Design an enzyme around this catalytic site. Sequence first.
Site: not given
Lengths: 721, 722
Positions: B269-271
């Site tokens: 995932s992105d942040w």
Amino acid sequence: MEQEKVQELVSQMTLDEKIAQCLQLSPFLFKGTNKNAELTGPLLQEMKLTDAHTENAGSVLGSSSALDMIGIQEAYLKTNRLGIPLVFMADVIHGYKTVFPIPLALGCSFDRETVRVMAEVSALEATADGHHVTFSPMLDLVRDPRWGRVMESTGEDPFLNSELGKAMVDGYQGDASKLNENLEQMAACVKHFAAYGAAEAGLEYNTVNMSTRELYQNYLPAYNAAIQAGAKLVMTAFNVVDGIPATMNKWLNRDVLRGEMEFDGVLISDWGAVAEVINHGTARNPKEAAQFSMEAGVDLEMMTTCYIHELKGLIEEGKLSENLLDEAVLRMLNLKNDLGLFEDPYRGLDRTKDILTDESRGKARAAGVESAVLLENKSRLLPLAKEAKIALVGPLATSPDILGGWNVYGEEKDGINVETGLREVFETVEVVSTEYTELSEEDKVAVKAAVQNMDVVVLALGEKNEWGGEAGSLATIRLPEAQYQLAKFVQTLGKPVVITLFNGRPLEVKELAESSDALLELWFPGTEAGRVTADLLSGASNPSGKLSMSFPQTTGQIPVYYNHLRTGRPQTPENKGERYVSHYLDIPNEPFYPFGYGKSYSEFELKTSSLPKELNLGESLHVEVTIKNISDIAGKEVIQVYLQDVTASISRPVKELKAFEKVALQAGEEKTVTFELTSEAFSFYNHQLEKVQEPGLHRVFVGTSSEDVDVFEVEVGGYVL
Amino acid sequence: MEQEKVQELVSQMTLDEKIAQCLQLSPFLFKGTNKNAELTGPLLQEMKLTDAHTENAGSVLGSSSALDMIGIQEAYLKTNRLGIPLVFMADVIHGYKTVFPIPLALGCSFDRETVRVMAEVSALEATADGHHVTFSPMLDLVRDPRWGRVMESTGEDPFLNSELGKAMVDGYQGDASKLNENLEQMAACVKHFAAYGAAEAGLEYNTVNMSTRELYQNYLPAYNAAIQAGAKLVMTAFNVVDGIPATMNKWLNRDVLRGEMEFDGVLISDWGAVAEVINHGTARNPKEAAQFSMEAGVDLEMMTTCYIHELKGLIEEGKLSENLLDEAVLRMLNLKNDLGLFEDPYRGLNDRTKDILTDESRGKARAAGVESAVLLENKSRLLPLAKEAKIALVGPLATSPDILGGWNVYGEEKDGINVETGLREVFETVEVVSTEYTELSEEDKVAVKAAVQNMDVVVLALGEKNEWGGEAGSLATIRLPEAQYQLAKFVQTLGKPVVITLFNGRPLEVKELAESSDALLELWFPGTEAGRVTADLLSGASNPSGKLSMSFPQTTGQIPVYYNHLRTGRPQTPENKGERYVSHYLDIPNEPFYPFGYGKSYSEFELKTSSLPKELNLGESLHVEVTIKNISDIAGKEVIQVYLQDVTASISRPVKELKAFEKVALQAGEEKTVTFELTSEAFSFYNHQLEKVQEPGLHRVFVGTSSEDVDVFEVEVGGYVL
Ligand SMILES: O=C1O[C@H](CO)[C@@H](O)[C@H](O)[C@H]1O
Ligand SMILES: O=C1O[C@H](CO)[C@@H](O)[C@H](O)[C@H]1O
Ligand SMILES: O=C1O[C@H](CO)[C@@H](O)[C@H](O)[C@H]1O
Ligand SMILES: O=C1O[C@H](CO)[C@@H](O)[C@H](O)[C@H]1O
Ligand SMILES: O=C1O[C@H](CO)[C@@H](O)[C@H](O)[C@H]1O
Ligand SMILES: [Mg+2]
Ligand SMILES: [Mg+2]
């Protein structure tokens, strides 16, 4: 006449007769026109048209008059084998001779009845001058004010466009089944199918692109509402829809329009749009163009010759079934019959007495006052006292260009300019007129001098209409810079300033708002603009319009609209100023003026009866709103109800307009209106293209703009009604 | 080790253990960290993390040093039950300590080798400082320069981004079957899957929306090419894709990524994109967020706690199958294994410090800067400047150390070379008046007047601060601060020849800059050797050879404008010019101010295409042969470009598509021949039904030195299939 005889007439037609029936032409290409006859030879020859084509042509667009129509139809019926009269179409967009506010303004009215009066008056006058069909309502959702054609749309909201779209059709057509009888009404033609107003970069005719789900969720609802309400024609769009020009788009036109929407009327191409699929590069030549457009169900080719020169060959080589042609011709004749042209080709025709009446003008005036939007009014500068000394300055002080774009028939000499308008009401008025795009030193001295005598400045700024409408794309949505400078100048003169702004699109108005005390957006009111303007300034009318399109902070914010998604990192009041939230470094996220925003001389208080906490699926929410004008002054407010779906299988807009009503209230007066939000209003299109309702929480928002609202919560679940 | 020992690790891991393996955390939530040991206490207690959680955490993100890493890993292994080391990731985007030009500039290089060398040098240095995985290449197609992140993309073209995407993976990873062996190479992670760069209004994180066909045609190719080139990881995108946040989008990630693109690696995932599906309004809470992201195949949650606090309960209550977690954990271990962490959890960390910020590496960053810059204007051969030319150097970028660009997480400005220092090394006489970024005082003007009066030429160094771009640096108007255009207007009145050296992270409105000067040189943000990149180009030591990988619009209101556009039904032509009812604006030209593939040189070339066949069968490659001669005294590079247009088709096709390109070096007089193969894949497109197809018909081939400077040939495709 009877269906059976219409079915027969199809039987009795030659192949060439049938092909020609699917052609539409300008008046000056027929024998017997009474204007532009000296263009007939050159153009007939360039289109490679012959007497057999013109003597069997299906229709005419843009007759100049009742007399033009009669001569052409008299001449046509003399040489026409089976006596199939012409259907006569025109662009009656916001008035015939009595020009009403431009449709974007009409949307700002938030007033269904005004819209219907406009169309009805328009039909009265158009049918009187020989026309059977208006190419209106224009139902393209617009989120991009660079596009010149936003002036033709009622704004950024599918619900409001859907409602007002129904009102336009009702107004032009009344009872859609008695158009053979009621000859003061005419056929409406929905345009442009579909999604044309999403042109990339507001660039005319440019690419449109969006997921199918979004096409259904936001771009189709209004064409559908008008259709479902009985609109007789649909016209195609110039743009691609998912890569495929709309005119030859088989899924869009066969599957969606005739299939899902159940539309069994005439589908007319937009001007040249059949041949232009060649330019889009989805047809190699006029032969292929025609084959694919007929396959798509386009029944009427507008002013090009693909069908005329190519359908015969396609049918003989078996590339194209003759049944498709037959079905297309059948729709043309059903249209003509519905209009009673088989009994009366002159559809009731002398009616001059009905055109440009004093009752009609009063209506257009009423439209104008309903539609104007008061954007600023600092320390009660407006309304002005009738004895107030007025410096009227600017390019819109005396300009005759207040009729708006898409005014094909209205004449500027019948128009009331702002000076005339203001002088009828206020005794002292000094006028310094200036250029639209210049500000000389001489002008500044004149303005200095006019202002110093007077008590208040009415600074009238605006666009020429030719800077909008079709193929009027502005990359930068600003007035000529000279007008922003004229406002900066005038403000330094020490006196109170009203700006009366005249235009066809949302503009960057921050500079205008910051340099004046009040700001009144009149859009382009039409024939009675001057008096619309005077009555609002004087208080004879009280401003009541609300913005039907967002006014961006700057060109770079576009597209900005009220019905926006949350994103994963929405800016909140408790995260403001943090770097890693959805925001711009150089402007606010909020548009300068939002959807549903408008001011009034009156003042109101609203309260919403208690609503249920819980609700069943399939169940309607009944919302009850009590509203009181708490001020000395009579005027109208626009109650607005929105819904949000807090959670869903698709990310849903933070708000969506589900109901609205404009409520007149005397000083002191109080009233109750109630809305039904049916369960469709709680519905949306899912990832799989199903129309669905999901149990879960919604918020309901009642108030007077997309931003001034009390917010309620409701939990939907349980069983389905 | 062997796959059996990996499969068994999965079997022996507890439930709680398997879950935590799917968690990634900043270095300073770990016992053993050498930096930010404060902050650990409050953030752990905000995230409601334990030692059970951190002792079993899958990975780390953004360790500060080799010592940080070693400290964390050593301390983790000591108390980790089965001995599953931490995988350590980082944002090595255009360099680690030796900073190279930002990726958008690299795009303008139009040179695969340069990109591969950047990636190679970047991994060399990053592995030396303890990092296993970089979060690069960023492969989002960009048509909108308002968006701050255009800096991280190589531009508006799918093909170029695909090629340079593969050069980046090739350079970071080399041969990826030996990442357990070449420990100066590292795992790469493609981002952001998918279509993140189409953010509405160029507004950070904003809505994205396009037909699935368009997704496949333009937005997918580059992610796919990097994946097919063997990129070890993929990262999710912050945006929705057709209504659904990419992080929990099953179709996008199961069907498209894992199904069609056959990616079998970690999907990170992105942040916070996992918990953030809640803000998008597609999940009520951390339970659903976790469920929907796991269903979607997201293997590694970055710095949020949906998985760790919700996956136990979801599996016990039977709402979510333990197989999904298991296969997720297996990809995790397969990545640790591929990296060689079960043999050496310190991945070779042995005085790898000898490897950082070397002289050879800085020379490479320098060459990358000179390859990547773009000469936009040069009237009456002002450039190159004779080395004895007396120089007034003025502006905000005269002495600013802010020249390394955005997404520079590890490079230090003190090691940077600024423009004055660069210029002073080469030209004997330099006088310098620095001015502010956002102001122009009367005192400044007096100083500029005095400097310019004395010298022979103005080097006017203008630019953006990097913080006006990168992530969440959206600009609604793509302009420099107005003081800078006013400074250019002012300088121009001083009667001396003017070069503008422009430093930036996005296309800007530059008509006013072009008009107020004799030359304009776009250095973007060149990195550690910026000053010397600039000096060499100005002097003629290097000859500008960059080309624009992204269109420069006339004004903000023209956005999006790009080369590979559709014709519409009413195209503006030279014959219909001036007519009202054609696709056009009233206030500006249709054309961008500078187009894709546009760039100038001190050299001069002619190109000659060998005779092409008139006809071609379906499935058949087109071989284009191009002879190029430098007809000038000055050595230089040119970028030959080949486009295709599909004239008629079942979908309205772009007027041009770049299908091949090569940068060709040439001595004065010199001649060369290169030949390109455009396969039938280049003649193909996605149709309405979403099939990749080839249609018989007419194509145009365009050979040249920009999207506008081309010779056009025709080819007719049909007959039978090869
Ligand atoms: O070009 C056009 O001409 C048509 C005929 O005037 C009009 O109705 C359409 O709305 C317009 O697109
Ligand atoms: O034909 C037209 O006439 C109009 C003239 O009133 C103009 O505004 C429209 O935009 C144009 O389409
Ligand atoms: O856009 C889409 O949304 C759907 C959900 O992501 C998916 O199932 C469709 O195949 C896809 O076209
Ligand atoms: O928010 C982010 O943080 C990530 C961690 O640095 C980075 O890699 C992404 O590109 C960025 O989206
Ligand atoms: O957008 C679309 O275009 C396609 C081509 O018209 C159509 O067939 C599909 O139903 C639809 O997904
Ligand atoms: Mg819901
Ligand atoms: Mg083709």
